[PDB]
Amino acid sequence: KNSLALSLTADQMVSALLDAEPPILYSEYDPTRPFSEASMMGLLTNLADRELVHMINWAKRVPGFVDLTLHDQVHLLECAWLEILMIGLVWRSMEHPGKLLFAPNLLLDRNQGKCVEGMVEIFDMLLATSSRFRMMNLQGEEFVCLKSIILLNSGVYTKDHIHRVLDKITDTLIHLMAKAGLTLQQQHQRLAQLLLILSHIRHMSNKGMEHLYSMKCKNVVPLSDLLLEMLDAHRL
């Protein structure tokens, strides 16, 4: 009944999360810059499909996640998958201001965002998030904590075990900031700053999910069955 996750130290938690990290995937090596809804969504559906497989095996390596029932594991991933893709996108886009690095060979500016409708709005929000992370000098150790928080939190109200694991990650976050030499006030101020950004990541996800439905009920790209099932879990 007792979870292994709660017995880990702060450094062990960080190490476990760092080691569980999925790789940065590539898209197609066609040097054609996507400037249409179809070509754009075509590359993105393919990318996110492959990323999902890595995410599912990543989640299983997040301390505490394995202790959940299979149904709860499904629920959390269904709720959080787009948020997790987004914060990953935002993280690797950090050192490319004004640009979104969907893949090392797929770098997009907002000039390409226009080429679907309502995308450029999400595009700017993502850019703002990335720029926000860059100015805060977000560390990889902090990033993997935030991504795990998204996993465990986004479906928790739709229980005590998860909240203890969440508290554990909070402890871990503070531990990292203390190790970085931050004062007590700087510590709780930064923690608050990071967690408030998660609210905006939720917002972008809600909006983005809304457009994935429009694209589906546009019959645009062939959507995979996995995606269609991840998508329909958010249906009204």
């Binding site: 299983k60 299979l70 499904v74 269904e78 069955d225 996995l226 099932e229």
Partner: peptide, 10 residues
């Protein structure tokens, strides 16, 4: 019967 149910199992 979700694909996610299958992928999460191993």
């Amino acid at each position: 019967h979700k694909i996610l149910h299958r992928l999460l199992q191993d």
